[PDB]
Amino acid sequence: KSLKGSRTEKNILTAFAGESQARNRYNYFGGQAKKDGFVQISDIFAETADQEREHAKRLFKFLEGGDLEIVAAFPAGIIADTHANLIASAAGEHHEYTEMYPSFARIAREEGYEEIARVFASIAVAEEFHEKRFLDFARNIKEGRVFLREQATKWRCRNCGYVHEGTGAPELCPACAHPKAHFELLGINW
Amino acid sequence: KSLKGSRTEKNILTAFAGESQARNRYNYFGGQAKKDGFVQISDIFAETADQEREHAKRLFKFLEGGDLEIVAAFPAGIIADTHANLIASAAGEHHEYTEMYPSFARIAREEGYEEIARVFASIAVAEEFHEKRFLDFARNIKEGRVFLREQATKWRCRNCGYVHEGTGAPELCPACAHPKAHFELLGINW
Ligand SMILES: [Fe+2]
Ligand SMILES: [Fe+2]
Ligand SMILES: [Fe+2]
Ligand SMILES: [Fe+2]
Ligand SMILES: [Fe+2]
Ligand SMILES: [Fe+2]
């Protein structure tokens, strides 16, 4: 049925506004991560930004047109060091999957918008993993485990694919000569 | 010392030519993978192409200028189905790390170009993992295990980050509504 005048319509636009701002913030944090020498983390911020773009697109497509007024609070800034940005991003994700989306979903169900409610709940699942990545990386930075581990393992250069075996990533990739910043733990998800 | 007139100079240009062609082929295969409904594989081809660009750049930077004639054989085509493209790509990687680069490295060492030899050997390591990825994915396609597994596991939508728990990826992402093609096994390499 029509969304016109419902609370859900307002919530969808509110979510769209938040998703849109999150996309920008994450792209900026991605640039900062690159400056801080964390390439894997930089690419993660960029990918997360692209995924927020997709959450926003799904939400945007439900709307039926016209200008709508919304009242909501948003993070006024800021761009800091990568660890701080990861912590702030995780807090944003946390609010979305623990408070905002579950609430929007419940209201949607109550107003009779089952599909939309399902979408809100589904987006919340995505935000929870987004938070996991951000928290895990923040923890790695705090513990000094981004480029060094206790036991020998495999490290992959994101720039050229070189694989290094050892307790930590090398200062310079022996293949492409790029800095340690480009290394990540070798992952196999297939 | 100067590379002028050495066999290594010729080998570097030969490698550069091969690296350059590999970059193009992989980007085309990436596009084909997208058409075949394999997003993770498509992005892998694209990433591999970018890494070949970096192998080529390292090699290119060693050269000292001027036009040089080379004699070498290259794959004249072709673009086929994704499984076939993965197999062909793996064969290309195989020749590079088992025959070409080790040979170029040995010749470089013999002519007194230790740094260059180290680079050839290092690039070979990258190509071996490139082959592993291609062979693994080819195997997944052949066995019908790209989107379905024996035991329940976690699947991530590359488009929006939604996480699905089950034996196989869903036909449609419940969050962004994109097709099964966007799903991959949830990976955590950090
Ligand atoms: Fe989002
Ligand atoms: Fe998110
Ligand atoms: Fe590298
Ligand atoms: Fe290469
Ligand atoms: Fe390769
Ligand atoms: Fe999705």
Instruction: Write b or e for each residue in A129-155: b if 16 or more Cβ atoms lie within 10 A of its Cβ, otherwise e.
Output: bbbebbbebbebbeeeebbeeeeeeeb
Smallest Cβ–Cβ distance between A122 and the set B122, B175, B186 belongs to B175
Q: State the Cα angle at A148 between A153 and A79, rounded to 5°.
A: 130
Residue B171 annotated as binding site: no
Task: Look at residues A34, A32, A29, A83 and name the one whose alpha carbon lies nearest to residue A182.
Answer: A34
Separation between Cα atoms, residue B148 and residue B166, nearest integer Å? 9
Q: Which residue from B60, B126, B53, B8 is spatially nearest to A173, judged by alpha carbons? A: B126
Asked if A176 and B54 come within 8 Å (Cβ–Cβ), the reply is: yes
Give the whole-angstrom CA distance, residue A129 versus residue A111.
28
- CB atoms B137 and A54 under 8 Å: no
Cited resolution, angstroms: 1.6
Whole-angstrom distance, CA of residue A103 vs CA of residue B132: 45
Distance, in Å, from the CA atom of A61 to the CA atom of B30, rounded to the nearest integer, reads: 29
Cα–Cα distance for residue pair A112/A107, rounded to 1 Å:
9
Across the interface, whether the CB atoms of B162 and A126 are under 8 A apart is answered yes
Domain residue ranges in chain B: 1-145, 146-190
- Architecture in CATH for domain B1-145: Up-down Bundle (1.20)
| Contact criterion met (CB below 8 Å) for B61 and B116 | no
Distances (CA, A) of B16 to B19, B70, B161, B187: 5, 11, 37, 33
Q: Which strands make up the sheet holding B163-168, listed edge to edge?
A: B163-168, B148-157, B183-185
In B, which residues are within 8 Å of A190 by CB distance? 40, 133, 136-137, 140, 184-185
CATH: 3.30.1240.10, 3.40.50.300, 2.60.210.10, 2.20.28.10. Which one for B146-190?
2.20.28.10
Contact list in A for residue B82 (CB cut-off 8 A) is: none
Other beta carbons within 10 Å of B26: 26
